[PDB]
Amino acid sequence: MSPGSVVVTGANRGIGLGLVQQLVKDKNIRHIIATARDVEKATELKSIKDSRVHVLPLTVTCDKSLDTFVSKVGEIVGSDGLSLLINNAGVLLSYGTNTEPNRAVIAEQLDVNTTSVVLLTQKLLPLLKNAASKESGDQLSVSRAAVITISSGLGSITDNTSGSAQFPVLAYRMSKAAINMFGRTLAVDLKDDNVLVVNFCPGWVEQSTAELISSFNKLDNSHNGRFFMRNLKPYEF
């Protein structure tokens, strides 16, 4: 089975856009909600034909743009609920240990990749718990209700052998470590609500998204609260 409705933040380009193109190929999906900070500019996102794709504006750092967006998606999915939330929107700010100490940069990296993602997921929980309820039982799947966050292998603490000297990714690594901790906590917290939650890391083209979408269709209770590679294959955290 397919999810009735999907939300993809940051679909104007990169992974977000590819995922939407991958998503439109599944004609059994009823709604496809794509967001862009600057919509009037998301031309390639916009060019996508098919009537079920809704390109809505969204600034993940603005709590007003969040409330407006949550309401719109609410008006769209109606009583059906939101089946799939794939938190893709994020950014990679340059910052390593040998960078002139700068609080504003570290704070922006976390605000965008962490707190904004948590804020959005929290607001979209009612809609998710609803999609989950619309089918009795105790079985997790993305077609029922899932919160998928696009993370990064650099978020894995135990796999961190490179640090941030050669590559200024300290803040980024932390923002994803945190977001990996959120996913782990969310899955637990939403246990009795039956909504699935998993985090992935895309590669470093449409190949990546094609593989992610495939892995999505194989998800169940056994992947809940974990962090995997696009071909699945778990990360250690």
Add this chain to the structure above:
Amino acid sequence: MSPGSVVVTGANRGIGLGLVQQLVKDKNIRHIIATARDVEKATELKSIKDSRVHVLPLTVTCDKSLDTFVSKVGEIVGSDGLSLLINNAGVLLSYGTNTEPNRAVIAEQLDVNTTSVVLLTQKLLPLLKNAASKESGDQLSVSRAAVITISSGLGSITDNTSGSAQFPVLAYRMSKAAINMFGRTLAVDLKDDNVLVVNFCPGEQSTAELISSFNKLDNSHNGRFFMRNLKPYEF
């Protein structure tokens, strides 16, 4: 062996304080710097009578308060550098997944437990490195140069099986995960500067146990996260 100089942040109470009380016992340490946000209120810390103890004001979230502090510690340690930086200053802000969505709270939790600590650490790097260059070779220990960060078991993602259900510790858990990531990162980044970095979960009888552990720390502990008795966490 003992560290020429030690910095303990937010030592006006709890573990921080407990560490300064344990540290002043090691009669071989030359400088012992303990911070407080409101120096006036740090009565039990100031009561501590000891020629080599310095109580400096520091409010981790303020960059001016950070620099000023870093200037004084350099002024105190001189060309010998700072041999031990133990990040204790921290906070627990109530916030779970069911909590009513609030950007400011999450932002404060991370700003205090993550970004503020990273900033303080970076600013002290010179001192920490200068201290490590006094010795020869690649031996890592808290007597040479080390950064000890007081984290928490709730910061382990692999061990998180209770989430925000029991207690509303979501923003806190994330803050700690991130700082453990910073410890794993600094360790790799400071490898060639020969400065040891390790993270501990504090768990009186605690701080006493931390210290003994600090004295057993070697190259094999670098970049890792342990419990006070040196039992390792998985991250």
